[PDB]
């Protein structure tokens, strides 16, 4: 009844300029008004336990066979985790042109802005991606193969913090959460040392440019050392790969720890008690 | 004489049996919606009917042009702001005595 | 030592940033006050005079500063010490600096006393007029009018001689400046001295080779004619005006045309009747469009000022055929200039003359292609209305103006709206409803907001004239229909219409017809309509009955004051306060 | 595109038409480089026989020149046709122009082909903006470019693009390409064979003596022997004397820089000359 | 109001400083005075030569020092308002008028032997150097680099390279400044700073200056020394022991003074954060008896 | 605070400038309001879209007489409020005052002339000096120009913007990701949004200006399809009739400065969008000046 209703709307309120009525508008932009596009969200508890069922299934698939150290746990196969990592990369960023595991200069983030924004948007829309990322990070060498996704998400977050105008970081709750989860995952994946793997604890208390500087320090560290699986030494004692940063010659990230220490010192009024988390040993 | 490309592209889809062709849109078929009722979409039928009715009857001491907002105000962008050429078609006034930004 | 303010601390501020130099010059009062007045005269002013700078803005600021330097130099007694530096500024190539320097010189002229004027200022004027460079010579022209009234007679005769020499100089721009300043200079002279010295040189100026000097001569012609006694103008000014009006250059004839009314006022009516009306005639019949337009705008002012005994004879015998030919002029600017004044002839000519002769000319101009013509014609409709009544208006001009209520340009429609109350007040309900009521309603849905606003304000006057029963029968239903419109512009238009209609429709109509429509718009999706509803409820609050305020108006305002849009909140709470 | 639509701006098409046609180009066809090059040369040689600029059978006049350069901008992608991919550049011979047989090549004396091969990657190249010379491209257009007396440009950066465009602007000269060859023993080297250009300076170029034909004319030959587009000019590195008489009309043509010019200016014998033969 | 008016009227400075709303601000007056004296002397050949030691430069510097003395030599305001080269040259000139020859090392001469005003001037210079090093260590939200506008490019680039030169000079003498500050904590005598009157007397032991508590000076010096050690503590954790001592001495001096803060303005929240950081990094034997938050309990365990 | 703002708006409507302290406080409030706005502002459907004003104050008054008074009419201004006009100060001050007073009724975007270099060259700096004697008002306004949103988005369909599109920008998320707090650069994603123009060409092209790109119909088609837009509303180019449709109604240019440099004699139009996105262009001629 679009034309019927339109005919109803053509009833002239006034008799018209000369007894003849013309329609007010010159036309309609597009197909009229856009639909509201109402969103829907399910229960968060059922989401949590659906993720739990999926992640338990993936852990069972990835775990090695198998009292054998009753307080201990089975080792997750880095080959199964590598499979999960490569399919994650393909699902999120199939157009992997800059897919080198070595990280580029952080100026290159300005060349792949669209790719990084796509990665960031997919991480925002699908919270399951972070769960899969930490699943990958549970097996040490596997998170090396997710280097492109980590790099793209970090570039997106760095752009956000550069563009942020708030004085506090909590005004961007998702970006703060994503920065924290990202640093936590690459620390748990042993792509960062313990000192540089703890900065996410103080992110919530910082200004956007400070957290941006810390993430740039993370980028610089990954340029120096690199998430390369050859750096991981298989330890037959526990059947797990190990990244020993001390043999790397700069594993503490002292040049990259100077920025963190200065950020702590500048905000010592609030980050005094957090100094213990970034001690040298 | 052949460099002018004075020919029309084969706007057709040669229909297979398992002659007749399906036409395609062209650049030169500018919709004369006032002069042709087949160019009027169904969704725009009533308001455009009102518009052409007004264009026909209210032309008393006015102008009987084609469709406004199409034949005019869809000028090529090169001629969009040609004020030097535009001022010539207007009567002249009375005398009294980083590179570019569309004027001096 | 680097602490002397005079040389040091000033010549060090010659940096690239000009604004610092202007700031130094702007605060030249403080350095001068720091220095002793005798020290200032001895060291500061010679430094300013001797040094020459090359930035126009600094020089302009310096010249502006020296006009108020009399207090900081030693009072009016020593004010002559300001003359050398301003003289140096009066000789520069830039004209604006020269004009500012001349302004400062004539401002400090008042500070001088007669003896000092003769001792220092008049030699300065002689030096400027006698300078090698023509710039000083033009600068000297503006200095005569302030030194002349307060000097001895011999010095006055000398000043007359140097002004005459300056006028007769071989250099063109010197003659231009002299002709420009001739009007001001001749204001203060003795009348016999004006005749003896100014008038022959003025006539010489009008006959010069250059055309700009002749233009300035005709500019000064008005003042010169105004100064003289009326018994002398036939032999002194009138031949010069005759020469000028027939000049080859159209600029001279043009600026004669703009000055024609003042000439008419100055020379007295009989001289105008005898000698000006052929000059006006061939100015209107002139070949050039600029002079024709200039003469056209002066037709009303010229004709109104003649002697009533011989006025209409002049108008119909000389002016009117020329007007008839100007109405069909090729140039639209001439027609527009004629249109803005042509209706002013209606009371002068009378009713029958207006009907027989002026009314076809109005009708021709009302149907012109040029919008300026149509706009200028309508603006003076009250005059012709008062002259010919409204029976002739309805017979002749009403179909033409009704056609102009749908004009392409909205200012024409605005004029028609502005002239509807007059017609309404002079016409009955029946005729207005037959012809013009629909026109009043057609404008409420106009694209231009100014048209809708004018029509809304016009509804108030229409209801004031034709009563509120007529409004309830003809006005209100077509206004209420606009409330249901999908365009929010029309809903806001009904809110504005209700704003102006509540005042005149009375308590009952506002309460029962308009208020329920106003209240139902509080649920509108457009915030603009919502806060305009709040504004309307504020505005129609006084003229509503007091019983429906707390019951009906107050709940809606309470709902609006917690709305999501901040503007709706603000206007709702303002309404809540005003309701008290 | 195909020959009816290949020519967008040819002869007697004004600059505004050229700009409008350039702005609206669309890349929607096959890499018919050979066919399009053939059509371009045919367009250049369209009016040669009407105006007799070639001077067939009457000597080769360096002052009878209509200097043109073809700047072909392309990529290194392989040449394609409807049937398949062509691994090599071959100009078609079908539909010969009237009189095309008189010169055994499509290009002419006063025509040079320059290729701007765009190898710009989709990623921001990590190479620095080195001020070195532009490389010669290795595509199928480079042999044809070199044969004509031009050269190919390989571009993979906007800086390189600017450099090639500047060099190309410097290479817009009025002249004819001469195939200089070495005759006799030394007095397999770059200066032994070169397709260099000799400059012709107008003021309407003025000249008297033609370059000799590659055959002896006769009045009984039904047909004229075909011409090489670049005359094979042979020089003897003997350092003879440059004899000149006072009033003779002699045409002087300045050679462009080349390894042969480098050799001659390096031996440093300005008072002697190498005799030149056809 | 402009700068030269203070040169023409010598007593205008006092009148302007007693205004409730001095326009321009006193720090802006200091900036103007020192910038005027910083212009290199240019001969008629348009050649850059160092600024001359004329009466104009001397009176400009003296006016800047007087304005600084008006603010009780509050290093915080001079730091957040004046740039590093400006404040550097201001303090160097303050040393010069207070009879400290250029080139002499501040760690050589004893501070107690010198007059109180000269000792306090050397002390303020070393305090400023320490605080400058500490602040330069911090990160700052850099202004966005726009396209080059040469007129301002030249000025802030020469400012930045001057700042870098001053910073490396201070870093070279950082140990000397730390030793100077440490020596000053031993003093038990009343100290006097440079006022209007003392600078005026110096234009052409001693107690002509404004009396300053020994507790307040000790508190400020201990605070700055603790900040400097904390800056150094990241590279060498053993240095944090010194910083803990300095900050607890600062806390004790704050407790002693109570609420009579005049020249000693120290942020209590920042000091509390410093104390917490030192407690966590250098756990004392008595810190275990003090109430430990679950955070610190987990860290210790 | 609101009463004083209303007084300033009433004063500014009569073409009387504010004092320096008033401009300082106004720009402070405007900065604190424009911090919260995104690079792609979201505008509700009933709005009037205006192109360049360029300091022609009396033409802006004509615009208000045509389209209506703020706040009664929602207005979207697409930059270029200064330069090439005699009353740049009054124009920009009134627009900023309307933004501060009526936050949700006024949307002011950034034009290419809202930059320090262009204002220095093309007379906004000179006007500020002439009308105030010091560049502090120019400093306040140019610092405020950095805060202006780059683009707007009416209904999610119409993409209002000053210049045009960029080869480096494919999505609106890229625009939202840009850091607009800076002087407009000579090259880069932000420059093209303020400097580019449409053209009757194929693909991208070098702008005749020294900045931006020039883009053909296929570019705007792909941009609209990829971003779910039906129209790209635009400014930045003189239109003789005030508005012009381009690229098969994918792009429309709007110029709201009649008789642009007081010599071009152009008309000026504004796109009035009603509640249901039914547009209508209100062409208007320059005001009668006394
Ligand atoms: Mn623009
Ligand atoms: Mn513009």
UniProtKB/Swiss-Prot annotation, chain A:
Q: Which cysteines are joined by disulfide bonds?
A: none
Transmembrane stretches, start-end: 128-148, 202-222
Please state the span of the N-terminal signal peptide per the UniProt entry: none
Task: Give the superkingdom in one word.
Answer: Eukaryota
Q: What is its subcellular localisation?
A: Nucleus; Cytoplasm; Nucleus membrane
Q: How does it assemble?
A: Component of the Integrator complex, composed of core subunits INTS1, INTS2, INTS3, INTS4, INTS5, INTS6, INTS7, INTS8, INTS9/RC74, INTS10, INTS11/CPSF3L, INTS12, INTS13, INTS14 and INTS15. The core complex associates with protein phosphatase 2A subunits PPP2CA and PPP2R1A, to form the Integrator-PP2A (INTAC) complex.
The UniProt family comment states: Belongs to the Integrator subunit 5 family.
What function is annotated for this protein?
Component of the integrator complex, a multiprotein complex that terminates RNA polymerase II (Pol II) transcription in the promoter-proximal region of genes.
- Name of the protein this chain belongs to: Integrator complex subunit 5
Which source organism? Answer: Homo sapiens (Human)
Full protein segment contained here? 726 to 1009 of 1019
Swiss-Prot record, chain B:
Q: Which domain of life is it from?
A: Eukaryota
Q: Where does this protein reside within or beyond the cell?
A: Nucleus; Chromosome
Q: What induces it?
A: Frequently down-regulated in nonsmall cell lung carcinomas and prostate cancers. Down-regulation in prostate cancer is due to CpG hypermethylation of its promoter. However, some involvement in cancer is unclear.
Question: What tissues has this protein been observed in?
Answer: Widely expressed. Expressed in heart, brain, placenta, lung, liver, skeletal muscle, kidney and pancreas.
Q: Motif span (Inhibitory loop)?
A: 98-104
The UniProt subunit note reads as follows:
Component of the Integrator complex, composed of core subunits INTS1, INTS2, INTS3, INTS4, INTS5, INTS6, INTS7, INTS8, INTS9/RC74, INTS10, INTS11/CPSF3L, INTS12, INTS13, INTS14 and INTS15. The core complex associates with protein phosphatase 2A subunits PPP2CA and PPP2R1A, to form the Integrator-PP2A (INTAC) complex.
Q: What does this protein do?
A: Component of the integrator complex, a multiprotein complex that terminates RNA polymerase II (Pol II) transcription in the promoter-proximal region of genes.
What UniProt notes about the protein's domains is: The inhibitory loop acts as a regulator of protein phosphatase 2A (PP2A) activity: Asp-101 and Glu-102 residues mimic phosphoserine and phosphothreonine residues and bind to the PP2A catalytic subunit PPP2CA active site to block substrate-binding.
Tell me which family the UniProt entry assigns to this protein.
Belongs to the Integrator subunit 6 family.
What's the protein name? Integrator complex subunit 6
Which residues of the entire protein appear here: the answer is 472 to 632 of 887
From Swiss-Prot, chain C:
Q: Which PROSITE patterns match?
A: HEAT_REPEAT
Q: Where is this region: SV40 small T antigen binding?
A: 78-232
Effect annotated for changing residue 251 to H: In HJS2; reduces PPP2CA binding; reduces PPP2R5A binding; reduces PPP2R5C binding; does not affect PPP2R5D binding; reduces PPP2R2A binding; reduces PPP2R2B binding; reduces PPP2R3A binding; does not affect phosphatase activity of PPP2CA
UniProt GO BP: chromosome segregation; female meiotic nuclear division; intracellular signal transduction; meiotic sister chromatid cohesion, centromeric; meiotic spindle elongation; mitotic sister chromatid separation; negative regulation of hippo signaling; negative regulation of phosphatidylinositol 3-kinase/protein kinase B signal transduction
For this UniProt entry, what is the primary localization, expressed as one broad class? cytoplasm
Cystine pairings recorded for this chain? none
Q: Which SUPFAM superfamilies match?
A: ARM repeat (SSF48371)
Variant or mutagenesis effect after changing residue 463 to A = In HJS2; uncertain significance; does not affect interaction with PPP2R5D and PPP2CA
User: Record's Gene Ontology CC terms?
Assistant: chromatin; chromosome, centromeric region; cytoplasm; cytosol; dendrite; extracellular exosome; FAR/SIN/STRIPAK complex; glutamatergic synapse
Polyoma small and medium T antigens Binding, as annotated region: 40-314
Q: Name the segments for region: PP2A subunit B binding.
A: 1-392
One Pfam annotation, family name? Answer: HEAT_2
Query: What does the annotation give as the result of altering residue 175 to W?
Result: In HJS2; reduces PPP2CA binding; reduces PPP2R5A binding; reduces PPP2R5C binding; does not affect PPP2R5D binding; reduces PPP2R2A binding; reduces PPP2R2B binding; reduces PPP2R3A binding; decreases phosphatase activity of PPP2CA
Q: Which residues carry this modification: N6-acetyllysine?
A: 273
Q: Annotated region PP2A subunit C binding: where? A: 393-580
InterPro entries assigned: ARM-like, ARM-type_fold, HEAT, HEAT_type_2, PP2A/SF3B1-like_HEAT, PP2A_Regulatory_Subunit_A
- Source organism (scientific name): Homo sapiens (Human)
In the UniProt record, the gene name given for this protein reads PPP2R1A
Curated annotation (Swiss-Prot), chain E:
Q: What does this protein do?
A: Component of the integrator complex, a multiprotein complex that terminates RNA polymerase II (Pol II) transcription in the promoter-proximal region of genes.
Q: Disulfide pairs?
A: none
The protein's name is Integrator complex subunit 8
Q: Which disease is it linked to?
A: Neurodevelopmental disorder with cerebellar hypoplasia and spasticity: An autosomal recessive neurodevelopmental disorder characterized by global developmental delay, profound intellectual disability, seizures, absent speech, spasticity, facial and limb dysmorphism, and subtle structural brain abnormalities including cerebellar hypoplasia.
Complex and partners: Component of the Integrator complex, composed of core subunits INTS1, INTS2, INTS3, INTS4, INTS5, INTS6, INTS7, INTS8, INTS9/RC74, INTS10, INTS11/CPSF3L, INTS12, INTS13, INTS14 and INTS15. The core complex associates with protein phosphatase 2A subunits PPP2CA and PPP2R1A, to form the Integrator-PP2A (INTAC) complex.
UniProt source species = Homo sapiens
Q: Which family does it belong to?
A: Belongs to the Integrator subunit 8 family.
- Annotated effect of mutating residue 267 to G: In NEDCHS; occurs in a splice site resulting in altered splicing and probable nonsense-mediated mRNA decay
